[PDB]
Amino acid sequence: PIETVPVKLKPGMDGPKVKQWPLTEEKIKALVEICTEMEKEGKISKIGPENPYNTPVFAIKKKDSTKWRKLVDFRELNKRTQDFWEVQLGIPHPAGLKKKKSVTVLDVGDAYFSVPLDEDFRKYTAFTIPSINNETPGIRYQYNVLPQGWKGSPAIFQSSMTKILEPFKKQNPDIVIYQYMDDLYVGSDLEIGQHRTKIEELRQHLLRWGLWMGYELHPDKWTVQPIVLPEKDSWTVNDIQKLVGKLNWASQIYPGIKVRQLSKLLRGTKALTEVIPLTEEAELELAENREILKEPVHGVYYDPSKDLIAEIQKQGQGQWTYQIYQEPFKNLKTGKYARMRGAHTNDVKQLTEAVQKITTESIVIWGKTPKFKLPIQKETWETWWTEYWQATWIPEWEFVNTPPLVKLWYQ
Amino acid sequence: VPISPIETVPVKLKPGMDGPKVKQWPLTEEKIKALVEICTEMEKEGKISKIGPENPYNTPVFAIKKKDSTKWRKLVDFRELNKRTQDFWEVQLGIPHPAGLKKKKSVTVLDVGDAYFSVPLDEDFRKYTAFTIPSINNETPGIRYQYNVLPQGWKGSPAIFQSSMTKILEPFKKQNPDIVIYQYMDDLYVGSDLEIGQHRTKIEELRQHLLRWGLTTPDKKHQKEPPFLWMGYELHPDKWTVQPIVLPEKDSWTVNDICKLVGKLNWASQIYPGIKVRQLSKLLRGTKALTEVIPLTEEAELELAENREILKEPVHGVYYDPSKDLIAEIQKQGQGQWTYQIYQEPFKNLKTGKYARMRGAHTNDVKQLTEAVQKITTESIVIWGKTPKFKLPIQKETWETWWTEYWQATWIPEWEFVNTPPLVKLWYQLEKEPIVGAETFYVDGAANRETKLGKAGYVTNKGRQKVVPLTNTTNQKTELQAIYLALQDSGLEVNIVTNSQYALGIIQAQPDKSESELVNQIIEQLIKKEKVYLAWVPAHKGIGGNEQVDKLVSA
DNA sequence: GGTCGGCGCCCGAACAGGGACTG
DNA sequence: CAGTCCCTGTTCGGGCGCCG
Ligand SMILES: C[C@H](Cn1cnc2c(N)ncnc21)OCP(=O)(O)N[C@@H](CCC(=O)O)C(=O)O
Ligand SMILES: [Mn+2]
Ligand SMILES: [Mn+2]
């Protein structure tokens, strides 16, 4: 008996038509049980080939979670409805969420199934379930309620969500709550003990309105990865050549970096392993270059109208560096990960973990997901990344192949 | 017209476009008799109905012979209607493979006679499916019908039939969960572990369940005893094989005959191990004429004779046992070619295959091996829904050195080393630190965009120098040439300093083959060396001999 | 015969995007 | 400075095979 909110595509755009990729046996069996139960509960209903739209579907398991979770790759549908969840029913991003001592993530995606979807828009939520060895044709479905993973679901449910959180926000005015996709970010400066207690108060407060899992964060402990120069008492020609090339590349970010006096030490055609003493002017140029790298870049600030871009570099030995920016050489944030799951054995699991950690930080700081430049081949990534995905959202990515230059982000 | 028991599928045209209006092409008098005989029988069965002059649409119609039968098949040239028909999403996601079949006690295969003619079409859409049957006389106005069922030739018929067929089989599969029904269009592969007594009953129950909706299962197409003819294979109780393949032998080969030859070789590669098409596919390149006669190269004739000798021996596959592991082993066939065998027991192959794509102008065996593993992984998930355990002709230490030191993220699933030459390895290793006691070469190269002239050379720490003029070259080719010069004129250990990101990025990827003859020469020199250390420095910064050698090669 | 859909392979042409140099 | 071009990779169009 609920009124449906009318939703339309962007002017001059059709629905998504993405082919379903092959799925493993454990994922298909999980999707059949889920889609049968969702069909029995009226959440989804079967359709036919007269619906020309389709969106891929697979299943995941969150961190330390045994239950399978249906996940739809609504990335193409979210692009074709962008003017809806930004212009009309936008969600504000609190700037104080990144400053809290502890932030917890709650999966509230099951609450979207309580609101019906606009009848004229259900045609675009179509998805197909594959079968092993193509025993049967594709079993197609479409959503009758607000789907999980669609950027229009939290916008429509925002009015219903605020009235559920109003009693809790009133009793706890210092706790910050942010909603992104199927996740609810609850942050507070409270002690770790009573913080989890306030989380359980919110879980029971949500169970009364018809809501589980907990992923803890600590944004105040997030550190950046600066550009560092070596500290050696005996420099060689090869050391100084690598030092000049690194400072020359870093000069694109810090315009005050100078390499004139250091290049004068490389005037002759010397052997690489030959020791070179640093002149008096070169020592001052290196020390001043170290002090510049401590200063923040001039004129770097986040623009809400610009997209976020994240580049990742493989540094070996389980080391992974990343930079987030909107304009080139104006990095809003740098960082480095180490000893993630699959370290020293699986690059794809390490890279998949890194993308999730980077995307989570971008949601807390700016409330936006970045487009990734992945250092991986397209076929290698599109073959394994679903085996390690543990998040209810999926960021956009492109594949790059940039051979290492002068190891700028890692000593 | 009676209502069909099957629920119709609502079909629309694309907005702002009318139905087709095409004139009927001339038919042979032997095809006209076949159409009038079929159109009269389908009209009696309610599959087509007459239309008056109020129907302004028309579409050509023809017919082809049925294979191994005297009956005919009615086809409509709906090429103009498909352009203006709404887009459909095909539910057929792939083709089933016998290597994915599990062993069952009983197996039954049955076809559906005139499958498209037993599924209704949307009443609001039957108008545009109008055709004209010409008579034996050109002056006779002819009889005009419209389709009340799914026509053959309309782009929506297969997608509608497959979804319609699935909806009819759903109540039977729901009541009989222990029955495996492989559904490909109308061809039904029914197998079960039930006893043979109850199996024939469930088969007859299925033949009666399909009969309630107008789907007839003729006893002519019924199959009760092995071998079963299913999807172009021969299914036996313990093995399977493809139906006999006939390679056409031609004294004079055309380009279209090569495409028909390569197509059957790719089809044979699914079970026949060791099929190559590298030399034969090299005949299809650079040629733009299907009917042009092309001579067979010496390498193409040898490759063809080897494929014919493989097709002489009989091969067979086995079925899938979910209780045992899946194993895939790869071998390095030729240069750029790879073959694999997927099996569970030794020499009992479930299926075979081959990989031979050339990705990039510069590659190595480890990259191509990684690409073959990924192709087999996705192929195995389609057929068996799981990733097999690999046996790879690459040392564990060799792979450990590659994936750890490579800048891209790369990975191979759970595998083990199988010692079957030729073994995949790395042919040279660039040092991570400069070499003590090795001559340091500062290389550089440049060229003019207009005159296409340039120089390339080096300057070393021991005073050695060289500059070579080059004609019809580019800045990239000269900088690659300068590194080649330093590799020629150096000892077994050499330190090279360049400012070319292009040249450095190619060499650091450790290629062993290249489309560029210059890079192949650089590779050959890198294998002869014992220690090579490459280093990059920025240009135009006055660094070492790189500035002195930049001014020497500037012209 | 020259109809449709699905999947596979092979090829070239068109497209797409970054270093390096020049007006 | 923007404009190229040299190089490389990707995507798509079209032929065949095979199945219904
Ligand atoms: C209509 C449905 C699918 N289908 C098969 N071929 C085509 C085609 N060329 N164009 C369009 N749809 C086609 O076919 C199943 P059927 O009708 O039950 N039996 C076959 C006879 C096979 C033979 O012995 O050759 C037929 O009559 O087609
Ligand atoms: Mn049939
Ligand atoms: Mn140069």
Short mmCIF file of N, CA and C in Angstrom, two decimals, chain B residues 140-214:
data_model
loop_
_atom_site.label_atom_id
_atom_site.label_comp_id
_atom_site.label_asym_id
_atom_site.label_seq_id
_atom_site.Cartn_x
_atom_site.Cartn_y
_atom_site.Cartn_z
N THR B 140 -1.56 -15.95 -61.65
CA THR B 140 -2.40 -16.23 -60.49
C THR B 140 -2.03 -15.29 -59.35
N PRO B 141 -3.01 -14.65 -58.69
CA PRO B 141 -2.67 -13.68 -57.64
C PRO B 141 -1.93 -14.29 -56.46
N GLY B 142 -2.10 -15.59 -56.21
CA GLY B 142 -1.44 -16.25 -55.10
C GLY B 142 -2.22 -16.12 -53.80
N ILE B 143 -1.81 -16.94 -52.83
CA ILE B 143 -2.46 -17.01 -51.53
C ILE B 143 -1.56 -16.32 -50.51
N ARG B 144 -2.15 -15.45 -49.69
CA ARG B 144 -1.43 -14.70 -48.67
C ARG B 144 -1.86 -15.18 -47.29
N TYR B 145 -0.88 -15.55 -46.47
CA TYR B 145 -1.12 -16.00 -45.11
C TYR B 145 -0.42 -15.09 -44.11
N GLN B 146 -0.74 -15.28 -42.84
CA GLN B 146 -0.03 -14.64 -41.74
C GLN B 146 0.26 -15.68 -40.67
N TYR B 147 1.38 -15.51 -39.97
CA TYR B 147 1.81 -16.48 -38.99
C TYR B 147 1.03 -16.33 -37.69
N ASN B 148 0.49 -17.45 -37.20
CA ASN B 148 -0.10 -17.52 -35.87
C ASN B 148 0.84 -18.16 -34.86
N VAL B 149 2.03 -18.58 -35.29
CA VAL B 149 3.02 -19.19 -34.41
C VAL B 149 4.35 -18.49 -34.61
N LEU B 150 5.43 -19.10 -34.11
CA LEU B 150 6.76 -18.52 -34.26
C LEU B 150 7.30 -18.82 -35.65
N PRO B 151 7.59 -17.81 -36.47
CA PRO B 151 8.16 -18.07 -37.80
C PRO B 151 9.63 -18.44 -37.71
N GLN B 152 10.12 -19.07 -38.77
CA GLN B 152 11.52 -19.43 -38.89
C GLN B 152 12.22 -18.38 -39.74
N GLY B 153 13.13 -17.63 -39.12
CA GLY B 153 13.79 -16.50 -39.75
C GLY B 153 13.59 -15.19 -39.03
N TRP B 154 12.69 -15.13 -38.06
CA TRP B 154 12.47 -13.93 -37.26
C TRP B 154 13.42 -13.94 -36.07
N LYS B 155 14.06 -12.79 -35.81
CA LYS B 155 15.11 -12.73 -34.80
C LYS B 155 14.59 -12.94 -33.38
N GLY B 156 13.27 -12.98 -33.18
CA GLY B 156 12.72 -13.16 -31.86
C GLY B 156 12.28 -14.58 -31.57
N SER B 157 12.12 -15.38 -32.62
CA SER B 157 11.61 -16.74 -32.45
C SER B 157 12.50 -17.62 -31.57
N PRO B 158 13.82 -17.69 -31.76
CA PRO B 158 14.62 -18.58 -30.89
C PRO B 158 14.61 -18.15 -29.43
N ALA B 159 14.72 -16.85 -29.16
CA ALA B 159 14.70 -16.39 -27.78
C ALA B 159 13.35 -16.64 -27.13
N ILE B 160 12.27 -16.50 -27.89
CA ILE B 160 10.94 -16.74 -27.34
C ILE B 160 10.71 -18.22 -27.11
N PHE B 161 11.16 -19.07 -28.04
CA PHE B 161 10.94 -20.51 -27.90
C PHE B 161 11.71 -21.07 -26.71
N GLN B 162 12.97 -20.65 -26.54
CA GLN B 162 13.78 -21.17 -25.44
C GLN B 162 13.17 -20.80 -24.09
N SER B 163 12.66 -19.57 -23.97
CA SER B 163 12.01 -19.18 -22.72
C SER B 163 10.65 -19.86 -22.57
N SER B 164 9.93 -20.04 -23.68
CA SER B 164 8.66 -20.75 -23.63
C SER B 164 8.86 -22.22 -23.29
N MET B 165 9.91 -22.84 -23.84
CA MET B 165 10.18 -24.24 -23.55
C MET B 165 10.57 -24.43 -22.09
N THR B 166 11.29 -23.47 -21.51
CA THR B 166 11.70 -23.58 -20.12
C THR B 166 10.49 -23.50 -19.19
N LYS B 167 9.51 -22.67 -19.53
CA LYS B 167 8.34 -22.52 -18.67
C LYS B 167 7.47 -23.77 -18.67
N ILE B 168 7.47 -24.52 -19.77
CA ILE B 168 6.69 -25.76 -19.83
C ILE B 168 7.38 -26.87 -19.05
N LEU B 169 8.72 -26.91 -19.08
CA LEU B 169 9.47 -27.93 -18.37
C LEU B 169 9.60 -27.66 -16.88
N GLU B 170 9.29 -26.44 -16.43
CA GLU B 170 9.44 -26.11 -15.01
C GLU B 170 8.56 -26.97 -14.10
N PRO B 171 7.27 -27.16 -14.37
CA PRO B 171 6.48 -28.01 -13.46
C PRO B 171 6.93 -29.46 -13.43
N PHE B 172 7.49 -29.98 -14.53
CA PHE B 172 7.97 -31.35 -14.53
C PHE B 172 9.27 -31.48 -13.75
N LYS B 173 10.21 -30.57 -13.97
CA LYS B 173 11.46 -30.59 -13.21
C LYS B 173 11.21 -30.35 -11.73
N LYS B 174 10.21 -29.53 -11.40
CA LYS B 174 9.90 -29.27 -9.99
C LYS B 174 9.37 -30.52 -9.30
N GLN B 175 8.50 -31.27 -9.98
CA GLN B 175 7.99 -32.52 -9.43
C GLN B 175 8.99 -33.66 -9.52
N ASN B 176 10.00 -33.54 -10.38
CA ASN B 176 11.02 -34.58 -10.57
C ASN B 176 12.39 -33.94 -10.46
N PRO B 177 12.86 -33.68 -9.23
CA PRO B 177 14.15 -33.00 -9.07
C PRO B 177 15.35 -33.86 -9.41
N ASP B 178 15.21 -35.19 -9.37
CA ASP B 178 16.32 -36.09 -9.66
C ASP B 178 16.38 -36.48 -11.14
N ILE B 179 15.84 -35.65 -12.03
CA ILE B 179 15.88 -35.89 -13.46
C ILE B 179 16.66 -34.75 -14.11
N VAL B 180 17.69 -35.11 -14.88
CA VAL B 180 18.51 -34.14 -15.59
C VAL B 180 17.97 -34.01 -17.01
N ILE B 181 17.53 -32.81 -17.36
CA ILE B 181 16.99 -32.52 -18.69
C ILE B 181 17.84 -31.42 -19.30
N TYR B 182 18.77 -31.80 -20.18
CA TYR B 182 19.55 -30.83 -20.93
C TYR B 182 18.68 -30.26 -22.04
N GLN B 183 18.36 -28.98 -21.93
CA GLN B 183 17.41 -28.31 -22.82
C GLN B 183 18.17 -27.39 -23.76
N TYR B 184 18.33 -27.82 -25.01
CA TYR B 184 18.91 -27.00 -26.07
C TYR B 184 17.85 -26.85 -27.15
N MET B 185 17.24 -25.67 -27.21
CA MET B 185 16.11 -25.41 -28.10
C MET B 185 15.00 -26.42 -27.83
N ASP B 186 14.78 -27.34 -28.77
CA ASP B 186 13.79 -28.40 -28.60
C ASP B 186 14.41 -29.75 -28.29
N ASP B 187 15.72 -29.90 -28.49
CA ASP B 187 16.39 -31.17 -28.23
C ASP B 187 16.49 -31.39 -26.72
N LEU B 188 15.92 -32.48 -26.24
CA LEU B 188 15.87 -32.79 -24.81
C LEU B 188 16.73 -34.01 -24.52
N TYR B 189 17.75 -33.82 -23.68
CA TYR B 189 18.57 -34.91 -23.17
C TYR B 189 18.10 -35.22 -21.76
N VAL B 190 17.45 -36.37 -21.59
CA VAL B 190 16.85 -36.76 -20.32
C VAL B 190 17.64 -37.93 -19.75
N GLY B 191 18.23 -37.74 -18.58
CA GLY B 191 18.96 -38.80 -17.91
C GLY B 191 18.62 -38.83 -16.44
N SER B 192 18.81 -40.01 -15.84
CA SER B 192 18.46 -40.20 -14.45
C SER B 192 19.19 -41.41 -13.89
N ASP B 193 19.35 -41.42 -12.57
CA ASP B 193 19.88 -42.56 -11.85
C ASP B 193 18.79 -43.50 -11.36
N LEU B 194 17.54 -43.25 -11.74
CA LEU B 194 16.46 -44.17 -11.42
C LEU B 194 16.63 -45.47 -12.19
N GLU B 195 15.95 -46.51 -11.70
CA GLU B 195 16.00 -47.80 -12.38
C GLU B 195 15.32 -47.71 -13.74
N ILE B 196 15.77 -48.56 -14.67
CA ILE B 196 15.28 -48.50 -16.04
C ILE B 196 13.78 -48.74 -16.12
N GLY B 197 13.20 -49.40 -15.12
CA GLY B 197 11.76 -49.59 -15.12
C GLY B 197 11.00 -48.29 -14.95
N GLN B 198 11.33 -47.53 -13.90
CA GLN B 198 10.70 -46.24 -13.67
C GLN B 198 11.17 -45.17 -14.64
N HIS B 199 12.25 -45.41 -15.38
CA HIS B 199 12.76 -44.40 -16.30
C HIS B 199 11.83 -44.24 -17.50
N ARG B 200 11.43 -45.36 -18.11
CA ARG B 200 10.51 -45.29 -19.25
C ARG B 200 9.18 -44.66 -18.85
N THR B 201 8.76 -44.86 -17.60
CA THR B 201 7.53 -44.23 -17.12
C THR B 201 7.69 -42.71 -17.09
N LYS B 202 8.76 -42.23 -16.46
CA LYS B 202 9.00 -40.79 -16.40
C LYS B 202 9.20 -40.19 -17.79
N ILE B 203 9.76 -40.96 -18.72
CA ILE B 203 9.87 -40.49 -20.10
C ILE B 203 8.49 -40.32 -20.70
N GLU B 204 7.62 -41.32 -20.53
CA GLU B 204 6.26 -41.22 -21.04
C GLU B 204 5.48 -40.13 -20.32
N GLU B 205 5.72 -39.96 -19.02
CA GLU B 205 5.11 -38.84 -18.30
C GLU B 205 5.55 -37.51 -18.90
N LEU B 206 6.83 -37.39 -19.26
CA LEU B 206 7.31 -36.17 -19.89
C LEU B 206 6.73 -36.00 -21.29
N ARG B 207 6.60 -37.10 -22.03
CA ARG B 207 6.00 -37.02 -23.36
C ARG B 207 4.52 -36.68 -23.29
N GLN B 208 3.86 -37.02 -22.18
CA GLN B 208 2.47 -36.61 -21.99
C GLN B 208 2.37 -35.19 -21.43
N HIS B 209 3.34 -34.79 -20.60
CA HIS B 209 3.34 -33.42 -20.09
C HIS B 209 3.60 -32.42 -21.21
N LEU B 210 4.49 -32.76 -22.14
CA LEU B 210 4.74 -31.89 -23.29
C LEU B 210 3.57 -31.92 -24.27
N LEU B 211 2.82 -33.03 -24.30
CA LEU B 211 1.71 -33.14 -25.24
C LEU B 211 0.53 -32.27 -24.84
N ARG B 212 0.40 -31.94 -23.55
CA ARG B 212 -0.69 -31.08 -23.10
C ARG B 212 -0.57 -29.65 -23.62
N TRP B 213 0.59 -29.26 -24.14
CA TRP B 213 0.83 -27.90 -24.60
C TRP B 213 1.03 -27.82 -26.11
N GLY B 214 0.86 -28.93 -26.82
CA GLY B 214 1.03 -28.95 -28.26
C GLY B 214 2.41 -29.34 -28.73
#
